[PDB]
Design a protein around this ligand. Structure first.
Ligand SMILES: Cc1cc2nc3c(=O)[nH]c(=O)nc-3n(C[C@@H](O)[C@@H](O)[C@H](O)COP(=O)(O)OP(=O)(O)OC[C@H]3O[C@@H](n4cnc5c(N)ncnc54)[C@H](O)[C@@H]3O)c2cc1C
Ligand SMILES: Nc1nc2c(c(=O)[nH]1)N[C@H]1C(S)=C(S)[C@@H](COP(=O)(O)O)O[C@H]1N2
Ligand SMILES: O=C(O)c1ccccc1O
Ligand code: MOS
Ligand code: MOS
Ligand code: FES
Ligand code: FES
Ligand SMILES: [Ca+2]
Lengths: 1299, 99, 50, 50
């Protein structure tokens, strides 16, 4: 023992002192220096840390390959395992592997932080199946998340492995040749013929024992019952990292053959308790394919769950024993094993027993009937019998890699050839603090027949037996209860169909028994080819891939934390508040000081300069006296390692004294808690307008917030130079200028002493335009105090808790319209939850007001805005900057106007739409209003009218499934609404070899700005892009830069770069004239020899801007970007899940500088909006404590979330003279188009309500955002939702009635 | 800077040309991404030519600040710079010299 | 010459597009930049000398 | 320059120079150097990419 030996990319690794707590990710990044693998969540839900593992399998006598999350893999489980990272399959220094080449050339990489993990998932797939199908390809990414691309390009590019101009050409891709793949480490192959021996590893706090035999396992457990077993570590890893659990002694029994044995017996299939879920899946699929349907009922149920069980990375390491013994309330397998009485073989030294899993196996929370000396040896999944049927269902927030809201296992045994119940078991998860069986309900149906009366009796029974109190953990009381009955209903019908033999149900009820079905993808992208006379070296308008895509696909692209640390570099961990609002009475660092490596605790008293910070000097760098939100930064711990800093910080004890807290928007209103005065824009005559109006509708609407979830979290490295207060910082931020001045302000030194450099961000989306300073200033202070470099990268939970997100919005509205649909008057009062500081909340509300009209002309209109001051983390910028909230509210009343009038929605929207030349409510002229073309073009390419038929038809033929369709437009004003920010500088040098180095104020966060800037420079100077280069963004090259935001970066930096190139051209002119036939290089050298400067700045100030709220005049924007989207969906009225069937988008981005990047921006923005309006939801306790702190609970769009048919078109022949080379800003504008899915869903719900709810066609039911499965299901009122009525059960009718 | 005090001299020059205390001026280092194609620091002319280049860049700055200075004569250098910033006037410039 | 500080250079490889940042004790940043670029066979804009 | 902290993975270079005023280089043996603890590599003309 003692020595751990494994391989990484073919190289032998010998760790003489392996610490049981060290993960592969940490070891790869810190120890081996291989930074390609990233930390995205350390929770197993994002896949950014994906790698491939290979080993010799003694059974298949073959080398097996599978993927795994490096963040959850203990290196102590890797003895004699070969690891492969992104840098082990190829690189730009050698040669890229086909997988890397294709994802990069297909525009499947934007910010690039997720690329390495996705590359490895695909690589692993190919390593197992060189010619995978399209379905295998999508399933390969169940455990990988991307926030930039919208997924479409990644899948489409990888589709080439299966079996008008284009964005990429598959014909140039290098063929995949498996014979050239890295060979399994020869040395490992030799070591395969040597029996395993027990190994022992000793860490700082933990001892790990790798047992080689069953006997060793039993002896150890008999001697040390406390010893915690560990196989996949996908549970224990979470407990230690997130639940403050510490197990001093761990035993990994993974090597034991008895625990890996698979046996096909007469009663079923037995699996060793250590078998990976992926092995179970494989064996069960085979069994289902080879054996008769009537014998695989239970296997099918297991397979259904495995289908939606985490992802490939987790299923390849997670074991059967682990899931069963973890005994999680929401286990998706235990309810199935219980309902089928799956057999469990449990052993201990000298003992051995086998029992069927039943309701008693799980006595209470997280416990099983295993003795402390016992371990689960094997599990036998039962063969299905004659007259015996089985079902398994799971409903979460998202279909792929999500936690179950309600999950179940259902089984029924009938008397021979009868419909008479002999046995019945309905076991559920997510309905209590453990897996339970509805024994009371089921026992009453024994000997009864399968009929309508049984269905009603069971539903009533479940509603009573599976009750939930109002304080049930997880909430969603009505939704969860409704699911328990809905699942049974689905089971009930399915059984009818099965009893019906088939080998009959109302046709309208059939789809209710169908399991989820994937549909073949169909993506099309339309854009304009460049003029035939254009030069090859002029790339403007061409689909040039992101300049750093290849390096991002190879893991060579450097992100902040990938920068090597200095020999003396320290780590910082923020200490934050656990109270929403309280006085800080005491801070005890006694215990923290005892943690090894502790260097110091920093607080307000350590600040040499000012403790006042924030865009509005609204905040403290370190809270003093009081905390005003959970997560409020109190101080920080500096330590020798990240681990030690984290541990020390955790034990820092703060004693509080609570103060009255204001959490919700409703709270703020009641208490009159706001920042500043009311914002307002009013035009026309409201009183007159409502008077002339035929109809009038009033209401309230709410839009939940949103977490940026950039794959790369906040991060800063601060390097003190020790001279004159000088400091150099590497930061993941979209705002280097504010970073620099805020650090300077805190330190008390001139701004010229601080240098901030941003190479790139793995995403920003607005979350890094101001809030990044929360980390930068704290790290800067640490460096100042210690004189050592210091760094900090936030873990996902800290990021989501502290950094702020999109502003939730509450709106009260009233709209006047004619029976024709025409809007005559509108009044909307907006309220946003701003948090514990101002930040960008004011400008955000302003942009909201500027878009409360969307694309409609409203004669009389009045919109107001209020910023709610609350005890929550301050909310800030997020792609859209208030526009999506205001646009969502607009489309909501617009949808109710159509319903009320009883007219086609598209018809009502068209007649209300602005026309060329009209003025907005804020009196700005709409010049070059292209919505009409986008609208007519989208209607046509989407076949809107024809599909409206297909949808109505479907709704008549389907009772428990419905479809919805909706086409939505949008306009987004372009420019910062704060005049002075509309400025941009650039600096360009041409060296004597003719190569050019360009620098500008904008930052790269994956949107392709540097790429576009290089394209602009190349065209302007008329030289190839290959001679131009952009290295980074830094305050010492271009000062006083505005944050990279408002989608105007390309516009303004493009212009500054352009001007700089003109000046260059002017200086070279005399030499070009002297030597016309000469080369760029000849002219540059000649200019240099004649002593002509080859360095210049460039600057741009956007003309004619300056809106005034007082006079309601002046131009707020330089122009508007437009677009239209039509989406069609299908909802499951019984569960809340839904399919995004198809979406067609027509966007006007003027003459695109790069149609690959634009389109990539369109698809990316659309998907984030999709997430905002239908999937992403943050939950807080009543005290203001965020519950949703990671990908496990916060579900952003996944690979399988995008529309199956995704079509995007860039409007043709629509040059925009208001911007560089006639292009248009594209960053934010397309995001709101994701609402097309929300309204298509609302359309579907309307159909379902007409099916089982009311009869009031013109009914206007409220649907807030996000339209999650909970909201979708509860809206589909029926006999089940009625039996689950929250509270007011069949036991509560008032004594009397009559007002 | 190799000990001859070139940066000290350039700060002294920038301070005179701009008419502000040297304490408000700073030189961190010499780098190819801030100033390209530079001749080596030699021939004893560094003060002569860089002093001139710094002077020229300073005149540019002064010309850009003029309107604001003229608008608020009693204002401070700090008031003019911020006003220039608020008015979206570039506060960065190169300077060059040819003997 | 006998400068009290002898010749010294720190070269930092960025791992991207041949980029390299160098901290050098020299009176000639331009030539250090181009000679390093010539030896490496990369454009001069990839090399930063501080 | 040398006062700048070293990176955790920073290496050190030592020039190998001629002991003759003028001669042909017949052979170069690094077999003994390769045995020194911490040895990483020996660089010569053929290692130059440019
Ligand atoms: C991103 C992510 C997504 C997930 N999604 C799902 C999901 O959809 N559905 C779901 O049910 N779960 C889910 N899980 C949890 C699931 O991965 C674990 O339940 C897994 O099955 C546990 O197996 P493991 O080998 O990793 O266990 P380990 O972490 O090693 O943990 C096992 C626990 O079981 C004990 N144990 C292990 N083997 C034995 C044995 N033979 N005898 C006695 N005791 C034993 C250990 O002592 C410990 O208490 C997810 C986890 C992550 C990180
Ligand atoms: N891949 C990627 N795309 C993105 C972002 C990002 O962080 N990553 N930020 C968005 C937001 S919020 C803005 S304001 C613009 C930013 O850059 P731009 O002004 O050049 O378009 O890009 C959008 N597109
Ligand atoms: O109008 C904007 O979009 C905006 C964005 C960021 C900061 C200030 C702003 O006015
Ligand atoms: O929300 Mo983007 O304007 S940073
Ligand atoms: O010998 Mo000095 O001209 S450098
Ligand atoms: S960091 Fe490993 S799954 Fe996210
Ligand atoms: S490109 Fe995938 S998260 Fe940025
Ligand atoms: Ca705020």
């Amino acid at each position: 023992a003692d020595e751990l030996v494994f391989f990484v990319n073919g190289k032998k690794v010998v760790e003489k002192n392996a610490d049981p707590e060290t993960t592969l990710l940490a070891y790869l990044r810190r120890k081996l220096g291989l930074r390609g693998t990233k930390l995205g969540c350390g929770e197993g839900g994002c896949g950014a840390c994906t790698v491939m593992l290979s080993k010799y399998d003694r059974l298949q006598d073959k080398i097996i390959h599978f993927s795994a999350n490096a963040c959850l893999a203990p290196i102590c489980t890797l003895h004699h395992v070969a690891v492969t990272t992104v840098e082990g399959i190829g690189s730009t220094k050698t040669r890229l592997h086909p997988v890397q080449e294709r994802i990069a050339k297909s525009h499947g990489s934007q910010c690039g932080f997720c690329t390495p993990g996705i590359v490895m998932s695909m690589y692993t797939l190919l390593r197992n199946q060189p010619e995978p199908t399209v379905e295998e390809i999508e399933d390969a990414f169940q455990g990988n998340l991307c926030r930039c691309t919208g997924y479409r390009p990644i899948l489409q590019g990888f589709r080439t492995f299966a079996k008008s101009p284009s964005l990429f050409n598959p014909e140039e891709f290098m063929p995949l040749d498996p014979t050239q793949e890295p060979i399994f480490p020869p040395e490992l192959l030799r070591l395969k013929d040597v029996p395993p021996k027990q190994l022992r590893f000793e860490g700082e706090r933990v001892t790990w024992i790798q047992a080689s035999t069953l006997k060793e396992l039993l002896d150890l457990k008999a001697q040390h019952p406390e010893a915690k077993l560990v196989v996949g570590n996908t549970e224990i890893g979470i407990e230690m990292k997130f639940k403050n659990q510490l197990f001093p002694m761990i035993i990994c029994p993974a090597w034991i053959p008895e625990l890996n044995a698979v046996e096909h017996g007469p009663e079923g299939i037995s699996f060793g308790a250590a078998c990976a879920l992926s092995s179970v899946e494989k064996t069960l699929l085979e069994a289902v394919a080879k054996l008769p349907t009537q014998k695989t009922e239970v296997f099918r149920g297991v397979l259904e769950q495995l289908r939606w069980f985490a992802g490939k990375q987790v299923k390849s390491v997670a074991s059967l024993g682990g899931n069963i013994i973890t005994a999680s309330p929401i286990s998706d397998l235990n309810p199935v094993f219980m309902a089928s009485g799956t057999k469990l073989t449990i052993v201990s030294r000298g003992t051995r027993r086998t029992v069927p899993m039943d309701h008693t196996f799980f006595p209470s929370y997280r416990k099983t009937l295993l003795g402390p000396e016992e371990i689960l040896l094997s599990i036998e999944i039962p063969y299905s019998r004659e007259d015996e049927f089985f079902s398994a269902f799971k409903q979460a927030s998202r279909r792929e890699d999500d936690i179950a809201k309600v999950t179940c296992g259902m089984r029924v045994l009938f008397q021979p050839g009868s419909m008479q119940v002999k046995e019945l078991a309905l076991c559920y998860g997510g309905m209590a603090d453990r897996t339970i069986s509805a024994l009371k309900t089921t026992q009453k149906q024994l000997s009864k027949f399968w009929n309508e009366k049984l269905l009603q009796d069971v539903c009533a029974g479940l509603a009573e037996e599976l009750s939930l109190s109002p304080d049930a953990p997880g909430g969603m009381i009505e939704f969860r209860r409704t699911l328990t009955l809905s699942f049974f209903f689905k089971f009930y019908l399915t059984v009818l169909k099965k009893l019906g033999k088939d080998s009959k149900l109302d046709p309208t009820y059939t789809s209710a028994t169908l399991l989820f079905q994937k549909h073949p993808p169909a993506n099309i992208q339309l854009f304009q080819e460049v003029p035939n006379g254009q030069s090859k070296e002029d790339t403007v308008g061409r689909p040039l891939p992101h300049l750093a895509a290849a390096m991002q696909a190879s893991g060579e692209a450097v992100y902040c934390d990938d920068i090597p640390r200095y020999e003396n570099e320290l780590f910082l961990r923020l200490v934050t508040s656990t109270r929403a609002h309280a006085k800080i009475k005491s801070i005890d660092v006694s215990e923290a000081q005892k943690v090894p490596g502790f260097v110091c605790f920093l607080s307000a008293d350590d600040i040499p300069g000012s403790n006042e910070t924030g865009l509005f000097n609204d905040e403290t760098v370190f809270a003093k006296d009081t905390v005003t939100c959970v997560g409020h930064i109190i101080g920080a711990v500096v330590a020798d390692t990240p681990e030690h800093a984290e541990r020390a910080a955790h034990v820092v004890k703060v004693t509080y004294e609570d103060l009255p807290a204001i959490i919700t928007i409703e709270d703020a209103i009641k208490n009159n808690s706001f920042y500043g005065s009311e914002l307002k824009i009013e035009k026309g005559d409201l009183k007159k307008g409502f008077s002339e109006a035929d109809n009038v509708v009033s209401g309230e609407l709410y839009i939940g917030g949103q977490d940026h979830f950039y794959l790369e979290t906040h991060c800063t490295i601060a390097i003190p130079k020790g001279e004159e207060g000088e400091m150099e910082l590497f930061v993941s931020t979209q705002n280097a200028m504010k970073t620099q001045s805020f650090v300077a302000k805190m330190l008390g030194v001139p701004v010229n002493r601080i240098l901030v450099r941003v190479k790139r961000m793995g995403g920003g989306f607005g979350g890094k335009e101001t809030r990044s300073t929360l980390v930068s200033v704290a790290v800067a202070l640490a460096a100042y105090k210690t004189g050592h470099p210091v760094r900090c990268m936030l873990d996902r939970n800290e990021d989501m808790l502290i950094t702020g997100g999109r502003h939730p919005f509450l709106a009260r509205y009233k709209v006047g319209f004619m029976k024709t649909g025409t809007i005559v008057a509108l009044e909307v009062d907006h309220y946003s939850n701003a948090g514990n500081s101002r930040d960008l909340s004011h400008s955000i509300m302003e942009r909201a007001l500027f878009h409360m009209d969307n694309c409609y002309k409203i004669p009389n209109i009045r919109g107001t805005g209020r910023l709610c001051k609350t005890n929550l983390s301050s909310n800030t910028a997020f792609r859209g900057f208030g526009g999506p909230q205001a646009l969502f509210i607009a489309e909501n009343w617009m949808s109710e106007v159509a319903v009320t009038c009883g007219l086609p929605a598209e018809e009502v929207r068209w007649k209300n739409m602005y026309k060329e030349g009209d003025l907005t409510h804020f009196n700005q002229r709409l010049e070059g209003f292209s919505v009409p073309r986008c609208w007519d073009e989208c209607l046509k390419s989407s076949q809107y009218y024809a599909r409206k038929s297909e949808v109505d038809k479907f709704n008549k033929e389907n009772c428990w499934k419905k479809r919805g369709l909706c086409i939505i437009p949008t306009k987004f004003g372009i420019s910062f609404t704060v005049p002075f920010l509309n400025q941009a500088g650039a600096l360009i040098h041409v060296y004597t070899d003719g190569s050019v180095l360009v620098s500008h104020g904008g930052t790269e966060m994956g949107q392709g700005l540097h790429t576009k800037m290089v394209q602009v420079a190349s065209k302007a100077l008329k030289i190839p892009i290959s001679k131009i280069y952009i290295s980074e963004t830094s305050t010492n090259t271009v000062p006083n830069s505005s944050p990279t935001a408002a989608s105007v970066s390309t516009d303004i930096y493009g212009q500054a770069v352009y001007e700089a190139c003109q000046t260059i051209l002017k200086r070279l002119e005399p030499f070009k004239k002297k030597n016309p036939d000469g080369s760029w290089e000849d002219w540059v050298m000649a200019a240099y020899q004649d002593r002509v400067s080859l360095s210049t700045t460039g600057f741009y100030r956007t003309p004619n801007l300056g809106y005034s709220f007082e006079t309601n005049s002046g131009n707020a924007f330089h122009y508007f970007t437009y677009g239209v989207a039509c989406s069609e969906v299908e909802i499951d009225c019984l569960t809340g899940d839904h399919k995004n069937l198809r979406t067609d988008i027509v966007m006007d981005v003027g003459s695109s500088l790069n149609p690959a990047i634009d389109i990539g921006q369109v698809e990316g923005a659309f998907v984030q909006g999709l997430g905002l309006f239908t999937l992403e939801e943050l939950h807080y306790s009543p005290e203001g404590s965020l519950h949703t702190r990671g990908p496990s609970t916060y579900k952003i769009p996944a690979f399988g979330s995008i529309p199956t048919e995704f079509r995007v078109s860039l409007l043709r022949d629509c040059p925009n003279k208001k911007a560089i080379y006639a292009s248009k800003a594209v960053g934010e504008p397309p995001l709101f188009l994701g609402a097309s899915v929300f309204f298509a869903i609302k359309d579907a719900i309307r159909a379902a309500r007409a099916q089982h709810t009311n009869n009031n066609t013109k009914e206007l039911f409220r649907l807030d955002s996000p339209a999650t499965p909970e909201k979708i299901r509860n809206a589909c009122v029926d006999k089940f939702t009625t039996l689950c009525v929250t509270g007011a059960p069949g036991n509560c009718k008032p004594w009397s009635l009559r007002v």
